[PDB]
Structure formats: C-alpha cells, structure tokens
Amino acid sequence: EWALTECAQGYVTVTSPYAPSVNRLMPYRISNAERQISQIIRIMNIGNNA
Amino acid sequence: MKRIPRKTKGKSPATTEPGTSNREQYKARPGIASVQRATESAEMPMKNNDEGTPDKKGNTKGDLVNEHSEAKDEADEATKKQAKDTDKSKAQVTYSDTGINNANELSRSGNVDNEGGSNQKPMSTRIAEATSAIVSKHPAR
Amino acid sequence: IPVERYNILTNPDAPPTQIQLPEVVDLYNVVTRYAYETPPITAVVMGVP
Amino acid sequence: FGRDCRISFGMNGAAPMIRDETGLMVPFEGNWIFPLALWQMNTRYFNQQFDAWIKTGELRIRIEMGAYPYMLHYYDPRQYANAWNLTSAWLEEITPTSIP
Amino acid sequence: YQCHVCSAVLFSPLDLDAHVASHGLHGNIQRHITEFISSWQNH
Structure with a gap:
C-alpha cells in the first residue's frame, strides 16, 4: 500500500485489505546493492549494440 | 498434489444487495485498451546479446565480422527497424550517419576469443590439432 | 553398522x-x-477528488 | 470527509469503519458531509458500500453541490408512495464526469 | 456474488471462496499473479 501510493505521486490511493496471519509468504524485499549489481549487468549487456 | 510444467528443457432469504446493480456509463479517457496495448510493448524485457561468448563446447558463437563493421551493421539495422515501426520509408530518428564521428566504436562479435586471438579456426579444432601432434603409437616393424 | 551416523538414536x-x-x-x-x-498481489485503486 | 477516503472492512461481526477528517474512524452511522467530487471518483465503491445502510440503516449524508438542476415527481397523498427507486437510480448513475 | 472484502463482483460461490482465499480468508485461479480493481468503474 505505502509503496504504490508513494509511486503514484499523489494522484491515486491504493488499499489492500487482509486478514491477520503470519504464514503468508510474499518474498520481495531486497537491498539496493543487489539492484545496483543488476543494473551494472544490464548496462554491460548492451555493448554498443543499437 | 499439483504438477507444474517446465518452460525450458533441462538436463534431460433475499440476497439482491441494494447497491450492486450495474449502470455503467463512464468511458475512460484515455481508453483502457489503448493504454494496455502501449504498456504491453514497454513491458517486454530487453533482448539478449550473446555474440562473442563461448558456447557449450567452448567455441565462441557469433559471426566472423570486424567489430567496427559489426557496429555499423547493427546501427543500420536499428535505423531500419525504427523506420518500420513508424510506418515510413525513411526513419525520422536515425542511429546511423549522425554528425558524430564515432569511428572508434567497437561492438562484440564472434571474431575474437577470450585470449585475444582470432577465431579463424575454432577453439576445439586448435585443441584437437595440438593434442594430436604428440600422441604415441604401438611399436611396429 | 556405523553407529556414529545414528547419533540421536544411539547416544x-x-x-x-x-x-x-x-x-x-x-x-x-x-x-x-x-x-x-x-x-x-491484491490492490484497490481509489480516486483523489 | 476529505481526500482521505479509505475504509477498513469489519471482521468477525465488527462493523466496518471509515476515516474521519480528524484521523478518527467511525461506523456507518450518523450524519456525514461529502464534497461531490469525493463520490464522483468512487461511485461504484460507494454504491456497493453505503447503499444498504442508506436504504434501511440509520445513515444520512449531506452532499455539497452548490447548484444543480432538478426534476419533480408529483404523487397522490392518499396512496402509499416510496421514492427509493428514484434515488437509487440517481445514485447509481453518478459518474466521475457526469451527474443526472 | 459480492466479495465485501474487496468490493469485487463475482458469479459463482466457489469463485467467491477462491476470491476470499486471496484475501487470506479460509474457504468456507492459481494462475493469477496480480488482481487490481478500480473504484470508479467496473473493470
């Protein structure tokens, strides 16, 4: 909810209701460094190929 | 028990609620389908660029083209494809014949291996030739 | 039998x-x-007046 | 109520709640005040949520409009008469770009 | 059929159970990854 609301630059609001539970697995949190590594890979993939 | 296939070859009482009636009269502007089609194109991942890398056997895949010539050809193909996308004979946005003298541009090709040598003869052929020049043989005569 | 393998049973x-x-x-x-x-991932998009 | 329209669904019998302007959450009951655009941008959700309470519960809403056209419907005083159909039709046809 | 958890419109009771299962409620398609519903229109 927070991330989608912040992304939309305050034009829409996002709501996602849910019941209380703990065995709900939604693996998405990663660190910035991993994203930076991935971007380095993506840039190096180009290799002057228009 | 659920089976998931692989997408890649591997090693081998009244109920009618008083508010649920549908009277739709709103036409989204911009339209939903128009935006969806555009988002589909941008959704696609970047294409692979595999040339110049060793294969399963150990031979660098790709073409035997000079790297600068490869860059020129890729630029030309990009311009051609851009022209095709906008449905024109000649492209308005060009990746080639710009004002910039990009003469030192290099593009990865299958001409050179990882040792800096030329692939005029593939790796496996060279290893085979080198190892063959020293094999022994049973005594004779 | 290699007893040390079955430690939590034998020891x-x-x-x-x-x-x-x-x-x-x-x-x-x-x-x-x-x-x-x-x-x-479930979401509901509300409008901002 | 202002820009912060957001509703938390009730659980295990607890009544649903919506956020006031002052950061408090209240049940679907009492007297409320709405700007028109707030309903225009969430027509379908609001019809799905509040209409049952409006029709039979104890919920009353004042819609700020300023000016608006109107259309009358006369009826015989000696006969039973219910206006729910007209009001429901009016509410369902609210659009983020049009009203009847 | 109506799912008051998310205000979506449904048509089968088993679809209702599946949809409320997406909200974490116990059942009284798995091919889905993301489900979005607008509030100002039925789409």
Whole structure:
C-alpha cells in the first residue's frame, strides 16, 4: 500500500485489505546493492549494440 | 498434489444487495485498451546479446565480422527497424550517419576469443590439432 | 553398522538437534515441515477528488 | 470527509469503519458531509458500500453541490408512495464526469 | 456474488471462496499473479 501510493505521486490511493496471519509468504524485499549489481549487468549487456 | 510444467528443457432469504446493480456509463479517457496495448510493448524485457561468448563446447558463437563493421551493421539495422515501426520509408530518428564521428566504436562479435586471438579456426579444432601432434603409437616393424 | 551416523538414536546424551558436521553426516535427524500461503498481489485503486 | 477516503472492512461481526477528517474512524452511522467530487471518483465503491445502510440503516449524508438542476415527481397523498427507486437510480448513475 | 472484502463482483460461490482465499480468508485461479480493481468503474 505505502509503496504504490508513494509511486503514484499523489494522484491515486491504493488499499489492500487482509486478514491477520503470519504464514503468508510474499518474498520481495531486497537491498539496493543487489539492484545496483543488476543494473551494472544490464548496462554491460548492451555493448554498443543499437 | 499439483504438477507444474517446465518452460525450458533441462538436463534431460433475499440476497439482491441494494447497491450492486450495474449502470455503467463512464468511458475512460484515455481508453483502457489503448493504454494496455502501449504498456504491453514497454513491458517486454530487453533482448539478449550473446555474440562473442563461448558456447557449450567452448567455441565462441557469433559471426566472423570486424567489430567496427559489426557496429555499423547493427546501427543500420536499428535505423531500419525504427523506420518500420513508424510506418515510413525513411526513419525520422536515425542511429546511423549522425554528425558524430564515432569511428572508434567497437561492438562484440564472434571474431575474437577470450585470449585475444582470432577465431579463424575454432577453439576445439586448435585443441584437437595440438593434442594430436604428440600422441604415441604401438611399436611396429 | 556405523553407529556414529545414528547419533540421536544411539547416544542417549545427545540433544535432539545436535549435528556432527563436517566430519560425519548423520542419517537420522530432526526435520521441520511447513505449509505457507502465497496469495496474489491484491490492490484497490481509489480516486483523489 | 476529505481526500482521505479509505475504509477498513469489519471482521468477525465488527462493523466496518471509515476515516474521519480528524484521523478518527467511525461506523456507518450518523450524519456525514461529502464534497461531490469525493463520490464522483468512487461511485461504484460507494454504491456497493453505503447503499444498504442508506436504504434501511440509520445513515444520512449531506452532499455539497452548490447548484444543480432538478426534476419533480408529483404523487397522490392518499396512496402509499416510496421514492427509493428514484434515488437509487440517481445514485447509481453518478459518474466521475457526469451527474443526472 | 459480492466479495465485501474487496468490493469485487463475482458469479459463482466457489469463485467467491477462491476470491476470499486471496484475501487470506479460509474457504468456507492459481494462475493469477496480480488482481487490481478500480473504484470508479467496473473493470
């Protein structure tokens, strides 16, 4: 909810209701460094190929 | 028990609620389908660029083209494809014949291996030739 | 039989979660089994007046 | 109520709640005040949520409009008469770009 | 059929159970990854 609301630059609001539970697995949190590594890979993939 | 296939070859009482009636009269502007089609194109991942890398056997895949010539050809193909996308004979946005003298541009090709040598003869052929020049043989005569 | 493999059965003093890595791999030990849920990402988009 | 329209669904019998302007959450009951655009941008959700309470519960809403056209419907005083159909039709046809 | 958890419109009771399962409620398609519903229109 927070991330989608912040992304939309305050034009829409996002709501996602849910019941209380703990065995709900939604693996998405990663660190910035991993994203930076991935971007380095993506840039190096180009290799002057228009 | 659920089976998931692989997408890649591997090693081998009244109920009618008083508010649920549908009277739709709103036409989204911009339209939903128009935006969806555009988002589909941008959704696609970047294409692979595999040339110049060793294969399963150990031979660098790709073409035997000079790297600068490869860059020129890729630029030309990009311009051609851009022209095709906008449905024109000649492209308005060009990746080639710009004002910039990009003469030192290099593009990865299958001409050179990882040792800096030329692939005029593939790796496996060279290893085979080198190892063959020293094999022994049973005594004779 | 290689008794040291079956430590948690043959050794009365070993705690149930004890292991002997990396010298010996036990062939009988405690395992934890789970059951999670992976709901789809659900969202409702409201409008800003 | 202002820009912060957001509703938390009730659970295990607890009544649903919506956020006031002052950061408090209230049940679907009492007297409320709405700007028109707030309903225009969440027509379908609001019809799905509040209409049952409006029709039979104890919920009353004042819609700020300023000016608006109107259309009358006369009826015989000696006969039973219910206006729910007209009001429901009016509410369902609210659009983020049009009203009847 | 109506799912008051998310205000979506449904048509089968088993679809209702599946949809409320997406909200974490116990059941009284798995091919889905993401489900979005607008509030100002039925789409």
